[PDB]
Design a binder for this molecule. Sequence first.
Ligand code: POW
Ligand code: SAM
Ligand code: ZN
Ligand code: ZN
Ligand code: ZN
Length: 425
Amino acid sequence: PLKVEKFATANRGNGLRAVTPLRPGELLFRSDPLAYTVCKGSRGVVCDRCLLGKEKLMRCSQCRVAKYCSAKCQKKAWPDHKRECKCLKSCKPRYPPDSVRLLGRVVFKLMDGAPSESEKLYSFYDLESNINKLTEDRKEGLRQLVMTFQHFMREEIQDASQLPPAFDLFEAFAKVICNSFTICNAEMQEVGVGLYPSISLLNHSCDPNCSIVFNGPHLLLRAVRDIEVGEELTICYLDMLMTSEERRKQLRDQYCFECDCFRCQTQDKDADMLTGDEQVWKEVQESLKKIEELKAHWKWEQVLAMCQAIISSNSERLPDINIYQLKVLDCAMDACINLGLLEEALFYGTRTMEPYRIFFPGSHPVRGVQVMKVGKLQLHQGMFPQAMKNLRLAFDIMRVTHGREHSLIEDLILLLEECDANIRA
Ligand SMILES: O=C(Nc1ccccc1)OC[C@@H](CN1CCCCC1)OC(=O)Nc1ccccc1
Ligand SMILES: C[S@@+](CC[C@H](N)C(=O)[O-])C[C@H]1O[C@@H](n2cnc3c(N)ncnc32)[C@H](O)[C@@H]1O
Ligand SMILES: [Zn+2]
Ligand SMILES: [Zn+2]
Ligand SMILES: [Zn+2]
């Protein structure tokens, strides 16, 4: 009972196409991960199982690496965790890269788990490796990952008899490179990485007709515009706040392809993204390397101090449509929200609104969430007509990008009903 099918494309490998016309908001596929793990920066901040941020988390007894919010989460995680637990115990004080911990979970799921529904349309065995396009530099990095894997997993995997038949570690890490999904929480904070082999049939577009969203580790795939019969389904692999040049480099380095899409041919939005003084935004782009690192580790006080030094600098400033200024405004808004500084969060949040409209066209889940945050801030401060306007805009977007199957849509409906009741009274 599916509206999509695998097919062989003319020049981008296998892909997914619609077998019937699709309309905005239509759910096309949903999947738990084949395997997933919390990311470096969120380890110890979010529960290893449900990926939610809780202040009280309990370490697993044996390895004291995995953390859980509840007995329920520890129990539901134990099948995925039992064999890596001894390895993490084996390997402390060292912690292995996310990709190595992820592939460990793949190998254990394929060795010990029932066939996974995440592989319904496409399996880990099927995934693109791009090995004949990897540079010598990439291949050397892959060889280091293999040896790191062999080290980390020695307590549980000694020889090939404990790997799937004809399982090649080098090809396996090559697949992880170009098929890994970044798992975001409801607030669009990156909290994990996973493999979803059926979803990995989707080729990329800088102007996609589909979008994915995460509800915990669970993934929803939705159409975000009208799609004709037989049309290829695409998602955007990349953050929207990137120039065509930046997209080219990342698509080359990680995915081994050159994008022929119409936005890349025309450098669509590049000029407006880079307005302001070049010397100023080069420095902000540098500072953002540390700001985003701090944010990935949830160090909100330090994020905020670094952002304020830019937003309210004594030296030259950038227009809010400059993508690097815009990223700074967004980091500062999220830090204020997490620190309970709601007046400041709203000031930064409202400044992001018009640039987000430009740079996230149509229905994009990231703009839907940003608008909902600004609406919620306005609601908590008693600005009801303005909050209502933004909450309704968020719903117009998120009914398409998130849908009834995403728990966040229920929370938005509650905010809509509360803010409406405040206006009616
Ligand atoms: O209150 C805040 N932050 C917050 C506060 C004021 C203004 C803007 C944001 O976080 C609480 C957290 C816990 N939920 C409490 C209510 C239902 C159960 C879960 O959910 C969220 O609101 N996050 C969220 C996610 C996406 C978009 C907007 C907000
Ligand atoms: C997640 S996989 C998508 C499915 C892939 N086509 C396959 O056959 O398995 C990502 C890989 O698909 C290819 N690809 C994805 N989007 C592309 C595009 N827009 N143009 C050319 N190749 C693309 C690249 O090889 C990339 O590394
Ligand atoms: Zn949990
Ligand atoms: Zn453990
Ligand atoms: Zn493109």
